[PDB]
Design an enzyme around this catalytic site. Structure first.
Site, PDB file in Angstrom:
ATOM      1  N   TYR A   1       1.185  -1.163  -0.071  1.00  0.00           N
ATOM      2  CA  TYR A   1       0.285  -0.173   0.196  1.00  0.00           C
ATOM      3  C   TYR A   1       1.278   1.509  -0.112  1.00  0.00           C
ATOM      4  O   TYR A   1       2.203   0.615  -0.024  1.00  0.00           O
ATOM      5  CB  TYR A   1      -0.734   0.263   1.075  1.00  0.00           C
ATOM      6  CG  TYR A   1      -1.979   0.830   0.419  1.00  0.00           C
ATOM      7  CD1 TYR A   1      -2.773   0.294  -0.117  1.00  0.00           C
ATOM      8  CD2 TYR A   1      -2.891   2.108   1.429  1.00  0.00           C
ATOM      9  CE1 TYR A   1      -4.400   1.139  -0.469  1.00  0.00           C
ATOM     10  CE2 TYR A   1      -3.587   2.674   1.273  1.00  0.00           C
ATOM     11  CZ  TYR A   1      -4.793   2.648  -0.298  1.00  0.00           C
ATOM     12  OH  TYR A   1      -6.053   2.814   0.143  1.00  0.00           O
TER      13      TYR A   1
ATOM     14  N   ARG B   1      -7.780  11.823  -5.677  1.00  0.00           N
ATOM     15  CA  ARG B   1      -6.564  12.113  -4.384  1.00  0.00           C
ATOM     16  C   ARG B   1      -6.348  12.316  -3.755  1.00  0.00           C
ATOM     17  O   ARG B   1      -7.054  14.065  -3.606  1.00  0.00           O
ATOM     18  CB  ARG B   1      -5.092  11.689  -5.030  1.00  0.00           C
ATOM     19  CG  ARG B   1      -4.871  11.513  -5.937  1.00  0.00           C
ATOM     20  CD  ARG B   1      -4.228   9.340  -6.191  1.00  0.00           C
ATOM     21  NE  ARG B   1      -3.632   8.892  -5.050  1.00  0.00           N
ATOM     22  CZ  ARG B   1      -2.027   8.932  -4.885  1.00  0.00           C
ATOM     23  NH1 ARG B   1      -1.782   8.916  -6.114  1.00  0.00           N
ATOM     24  NH2 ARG B   1      -1.523   8.864  -4.193  1.00  0.00           N
TER      25      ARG B   1
ATOM     26  N   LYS C   1      -6.397  -1.338  -1.230  1.00  0.00           N
ATOM     27  CA  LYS C   1      -7.098  -1.081   0.013  1.00  0.00           C
ATOM     28  C   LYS C   1      -8.142  -2.130   0.099  1.00  0.00           C
ATOM     29  O   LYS C   1      -8.161  -2.461   1.385  1.00  0.00           O
ATOM     30  CB  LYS C   1      -7.906   0.223   0.508  1.00  0.00           C
ATOM     31  CG  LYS C   1      -8.505   0.744   1.337  1.00  0.00           C
ATOM     32  CD  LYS C   1      -7.570   0.788   2.592  1.00  0.00           C
ATOM     33  CE  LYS C   1      -8.258   2.073   3.840  1.00  0.00           C
ATOM     34  NZ  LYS C   1      -7.022   2.699   3.886  1.00  0.00           N
TER      35      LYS C   1
ATOM     36  N   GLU D   1     -12.092   6.150  -0.502  1.00  0.00           N
ATOM     37  CA  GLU D   1     -11.094   5.768  -0.283  1.00  0.00           C
ATOM     38  C   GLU D   1      -9.757   7.259  -1.144  1.00  0.00           C
ATOM     39  O   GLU D   1     -10.764   6.942  -2.540  1.00  0.00           O
ATOM     40  CB  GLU D   1      -9.959   4.368  -0.529  1.00  0.00           C
ATOM     41  CG  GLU D   1      -8.673   4.760  -0.275  1.00  0.00           C
ATOM     42  CD  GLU D   1      -8.250   4.590   0.905  1.00  0.00           C
ATOM     43  OE1 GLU D   1      -9.391   4.781   2.606  1.00  0.00           O
ATOM     44  OE2 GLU D   1      -6.818   4.632   1.362  1.00  0.00           O
ATOM     45  N   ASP D   2      -9.292   8.403  -0.694  1.00  0.00           N
ATOM     46  CA  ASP D   2      -8.572   8.821  -2.159  1.00  0.00           C
ATOM     47  C   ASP D   2      -9.097   9.946  -2.436  1.00  0.00           C
ATOM     48  O   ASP D   2      -8.693   9.825  -4.207  1.00  0.00           O
ATOM     49  CB  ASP D   2      -7.222   8.097  -2.670  1.00  0.00           C
ATOM     50  CG  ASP D   2      -6.087   8.285  -2.795  1.00  0.00           C
ATOM     51  OD1 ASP D   2      -6.042   8.822  -1.894  1.00  0.00           O
ATOM     52  OD2 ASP D   2      -5.488   7.695  -3.321  1.00  0.00           O
TER      53      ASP D   2
ATOM     54  N   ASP E   1     -12.133   5.916   5.126  1.00  0.00           N
ATOM     55  CA  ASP E   1     -11.090   6.132   6.339  1.00  0.00           C
ATOM     56  C   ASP E   1      -9.778   7.468   6.712  1.00  0.00           C
ATOM     57  O   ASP E   1      -9.582   6.952   7.088  1.00  0.00           O
ATOM     58  CB  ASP E   1     -10.393   4.981   5.529  1.00  0.00           C
ATOM     59  CG  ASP E   1      -9.143   4.461   6.236  1.00  0.00           C
ATOM     60  OD1 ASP E   1      -9.630   4.597   7.564  1.00  0.00           O
ATOM     61  OD2 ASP E   1      -7.379   4.528   6.384  1.00  0.00           O
ATOM     62  N   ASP E   2      -9.762   7.560   5.057  1.00  0.00           N
ATOM     63  CA  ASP E   2      -8.884   9.261   5.048  1.00  0.00           C
ATOM     64  C   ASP E   2      -9.473  10.309   5.882  1.00  0.00           C
ATOM     65  O   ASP E   2      -8.258  10.267   7.123  1.00  0.00           O
ATOM     66  CB  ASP E   2      -8.711  10.210   3.737  1.00  0.00           C
ATOM     67  CG  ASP E   2      -8.626   8.585   2.791  1.00  0.00           C
ATOM     68  OD1 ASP E   2      -7.465   8.175   3.321  1.00  0.00           O
ATOM     69  OD2 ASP E   2      -8.938   9.238   1.966  1.00  0.00           O
TER      70      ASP E   2
ATOM     71  N   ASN F   1       2.555  13.284   6.277  1.00  0.00           N
ATOM     72  CA  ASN F   1       3.183  12.977   4.634  1.00  0.00           C
ATOM     73  C   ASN F   1       3.031  13.404   2.884  1.00  0.00           C
ATOM     74  O   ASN F   1       2.433  14.339   3.428  1.00  0.00           O
ATOM     75  CB  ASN F   1       1.603  11.725   4.304  1.00  0.00           C
ATOM     76  CG  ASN F   1       1.281  10.715   5.936  1.00  0.00           C
ATOM     77  OD1 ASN F   1       2.760  10.113   6.336  1.00  0.00           O
ATOM     78  ND2 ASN F   1       0.532  10.582   6.303  1.00  0.00           N
TER      79      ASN F   1
END
Ligand SMILES: COc1ccc(NS(=O)(=O)c2cccc(NC(=O)c3cc(F)cc(F)c3)c2)cc1
Ligand SMILES: COc1ccc(NS(=O)(=O)c2cccc(NC(=O)c3cc(F)cc(F)c3)c2)cc1
Lengths: 545, 545
Positions: free
Chosen positions: A88, A141, A159, A230-231, A253-254, A401
């Site tokens: 990942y 993203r 994921k 996700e993203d 989840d982010d 990050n």
């Protein structure tokens, strides 16, 4: 015969005994060595570990996943801390960006405007029953870097695989989805080998028309499933949750996973610090919606676990944006998300003299530095030394990050405080030794929460996922850090113990849902010890059976 | 549904039209771009060509072969000269040596002493009907370098794939075989991850007991098949052919293929030289059985095509071994294989003064240098210049493998003769430009002959493969070099035209077998034009149908 070997779910390769090879008529289809799973994992690990570049390692693991699903997941779990950056973030992103051909074999589902009104038929024709987990991205993203468009399917594939490894979701019951609404990646738009919709991202209205149809089609055909976003970029991710959180079983989840994980670790950082929650002075470096989301998750968890008045937990927080200390007296119109954490106890004149981090830290005298800036190493040696003046145990969390954005290295933080700093990050870092004494930062990895949320909602079948289940998962993770772990300076249970963590997190989420009476699966035990034992048995295991 | 996509023989990926995707219920299983085969080949080629190291390129091609068999073979044929060193010698050997995990998915059959008496059941249980081509190795290697034992299956897999690409053998009708009789690779014997029989190679007697059982089991269960021996060491390869050539349909491409290809090219080299076959003085540098095999194939072909007395063709040959010029008067006991080409016209005293190549070339005054030494660049500038004195067009053939063993580079040969040299090698080399005039050596690749031999024996069903069919294939290849090719200095038809070459070679082999009345397939036309057209139609084609 060669049919058993060509199904990746039941194939055991060299783990078929001689006598099994005879009965199954596959004598002569395998070299003659017979191996146990343990031996096959050590062999695969040896193969993987000799490749020099992450994307090479990922490519090898993709071939194992293609042939022997059991041996793949068994290899991941035996070497999880090492394999996580390969399977990942950040290898997966490079794989999508430049090696999207690695995802072609996998079980992706593709939606776009050309199939408008057919989303249900596409889902039906996929021929998956009692699907538990759907990861969807549009490839825009979260970090707003490298729009991948259609190639975003590699993110959903990666994921989905972490739910199987982390919480034992059965690999036949996960579905990775790309909703292709276009791409603003200009290389892709001119790339002859781009296979997606070759157009700019749709406007909001057509975006929500397609995503609405997806959410409704999933609720009818995949009724048992959790939908995890996700993203998705910041322009959409928050608004998606406000639009769907109540009508469907969905989370991001982010947004929600990240805060749940950071909060659990931060409270354990408080326990080791000496300085209790109402005594903490916390600089939040960075004031985006996500950074304020994390501060609020910390407040909410401290209120749940300790019944301090939540207003009082909020006053421990000093928010820094691009301008400086966020205050009510500094004379700008504050974004809604920043009003809540604005100082009310700081004069206009002091505000004007509180703009650089160094002078903000000199005035506030913080006990904790939360790094959510993503603008480089803002936590200088002098800033860290200043925190040494206000506490024996500075809590320093460089969470930005990727690692080059981070506010400080665990090594510098440990060095500058002579081992006193309590450190967590997003990324794994090696141990630092200071005068014969070893220190290793805690990794606040999202793997700690989303799998257990997934497994809990798979079993419970909640009508939806309100904030209460995410808070429960946050507390459950905090409470699994044992006195022995705390004694050794760990802020989280060990990553290696992810199955146990995921069983515990699921159990707690289920009891929260039962308590709220939003659960639709009445087959479940309603007391913790029995539920935990039942959950552990429902989990898919990477062993031959 | 996702079943069609998961069968590599019928999967078309993005070549499924929109309307096909609808009918087959795989809308939403593919990105939305629709491609033609041509577009898919250019995309795969682009993916392959961006990887920097051969083994990376091979690994990518293995994944295409795994998903879409048609697109794999289509890619190979559009870029054959470039892809040949990746998909076979020498990348395949490195893949076997260190990446044997790339072969695990493929359709290998494994034999060893532990299955003694069960070879037939293993073949039956494989569930393959009307198998046409079986490649078998024991991994000992022809060049006696890097014994691969069980990992030799990658060699059989690679060779089988070249029959499909080269001659359109249907990919469901080829079977790669490893006969594992042990290994003398000492790293493998101590390697925990070696999956073969962990023991020294069996003695001759147990070796022939297992190989006999294999040959008899194949004749009963795979009656329609050709058995081709690949990469067997010198201690066994010749003796295997003497033992089996008459009782079974078998050949060895290393021995018989190599000579057939070199002979066809050498005769065309004669046509361009000025100097006719009885006027050639040929130094054969190297005197192993293989080198003498090639000289004899050249003699045999020149006799077939030109009816010169074969004794007279033999006297054009001057054999050099490690000692010097092979003569009847030099005073050693000559190996049987060397007596035939020994000079009878050289005194003992001259023999003693003919030991270094330089002085052998000064005395013999050759028109041709055949490099089969494999001891480095023995064809020096002065040796090449000396040949310029005896002919306008020196024939210089550095055939020793690998390229570092070779007697001379095409570039040096062309330079030293100012473009006069006629050059062939085993390996592809780029063109050399000399004063605005471009030269490129001819590649004597075994792909020219074995596929057509395979396709010819598949259709003809001969009781066996006597030398006459190999000679016919040798002549057929010579005769397909057109006047236009010859005019442009080519010794062979172009490699790219392999399907046409293989159809022609098969046709000629079939007519030779019919003529000898050893054919068992009476359905075939018995006249060339009709046969050639029938053969071309029987060939599997890498296009969607
Ligand atoms: C590159 O990816 C991998 C996959 C699996 C393994 N380990 S293993 O599963 O123990 C293993 C070992 C050796 C041979 C086979 N063959 C088959 O599994 C096989 C499958 C077939 F479909 C047909 C066949 F002949 C063999 C399997 C390592 C790396
Ligand atoms: C790495 O190896 C390869 C293989 C094939 C290709 N080209 S392609 O065949 O045109 C292609 C292109 C895009 C997606 C798919 N997907 C499936 O073929 C597919 C297969 C499945 F089994 C399930 C699925 F959803 C898609 C196929 C390139 C590289």
């Amino acid at each position: 015969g060669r049919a058993i070997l060509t199904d990746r779910y039941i194939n055991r390769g060299t783990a078929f005994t001689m006598e099994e090879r005879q009965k199954l008529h596959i004598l002569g289809r395998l070299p003659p060595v017979v191996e146990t799973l343990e031996e096959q994992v050590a062999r695969v690990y040896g193969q993987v570990k000799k490749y020099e570049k992450p994307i090479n390692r990922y490519q090898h693991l993709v071939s194992v996943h293609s042939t022997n699903t059991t041996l793949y997941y068994a290899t991941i779990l035996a070497h999880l801390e090492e394999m996580l950056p390969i399977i990942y973030t950040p290898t997966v992103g490079e794989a999508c960006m430049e090696y999207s051909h690695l995802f072609f074999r996998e079980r992706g589902v593709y939606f776009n405007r050309l199939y408008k009104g057919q989303f249900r038929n596409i889902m039906r024709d996929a021929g998956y029953q009692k699907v538990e987990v759907v990861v969807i991205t549009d490839g825009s993203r979260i970090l707003g870097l490298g729009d991948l468009g259609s190639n975003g399917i590699g993110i959903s594939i990666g994921k989905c695989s972490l739910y199987v490894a982390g919480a034992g979701i059965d690999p036949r019951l996960i579905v990775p989805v790309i909703l292709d609404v276009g791409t603003n990646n200009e290389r892709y738009l001119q790339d002859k080998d781009y296979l997606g919709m070759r157009e700019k991202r749709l406007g909001d209205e057509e975006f929500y028309e397609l995503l609405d149809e997806f959410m409704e089609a999933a609720s009818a055909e995949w009724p048992n499933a959790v939908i995890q976003f996700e993203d998705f970029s910041n322009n959409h991710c928050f608004d998606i949750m406000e639009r769907y959180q109540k009508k469907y079983r969905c989370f991001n989840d982010d947004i929600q996973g990240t805060g749940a994980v950071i909060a659990a670790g931060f409270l354990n950082a408080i326990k080791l610090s000496g300085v209790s929650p109402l005594q903490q002075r916390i600089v939040v470096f960075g004031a985006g919606s996500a950074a304020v989301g994390v501060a609020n998750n910390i407040a909410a968890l401290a209120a749940r676990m300790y019944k301090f008045p939540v207003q009082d937990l909020v006053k421990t927080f000093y928010l820094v944006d691009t301008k400086g200390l966020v205050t009510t007296t500094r004379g700008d119109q504050l974004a809604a998300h920043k009003k809540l954490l604005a100082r009310t106890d700081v004069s206009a004149e002091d505000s004007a003299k509180l703009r650089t981090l160094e002078e903000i830290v000199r005035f506030v005298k913080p006990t904790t530095l939360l790094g959510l800036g993503g603008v480089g190493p803002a936590f200088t040696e002098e800033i860290v030394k200043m925190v040494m003046q206000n506490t024996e145990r500075p809590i320093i969390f460089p969470l930005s990050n990727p690692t080059s954005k981070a506010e400080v290295t665990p090594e510098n933080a440990y060095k500058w405080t002579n081992g006193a700093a309590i450190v967590a990050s997003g990324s794994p870092f090696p141990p630092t030794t200071i005068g014969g004494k070893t220190f290793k930062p805690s990794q606040g990895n999202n793997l700690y929460v989303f799998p257990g949320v997934g497994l809990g909602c798979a079993l419970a079948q909640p009508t939806h996922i309100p904030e209460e289940l995410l808070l429960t998962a946050s507390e459950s993770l905090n409470l699994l850090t044992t006195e022995g772990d705390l004694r050794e300076g760990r802020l989280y249970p060990p990553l290696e113990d992810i199955h146990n963590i995921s069983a515990n997190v699921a159990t707690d989420v289920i009891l929260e849902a039962q308590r709220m009476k939003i659960d639709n699966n009445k087959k479940l035990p309603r007391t913790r010890d029995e539920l935990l034992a039942f959950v552990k048995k429902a989990m898919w295991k990477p062993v031959y059976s």
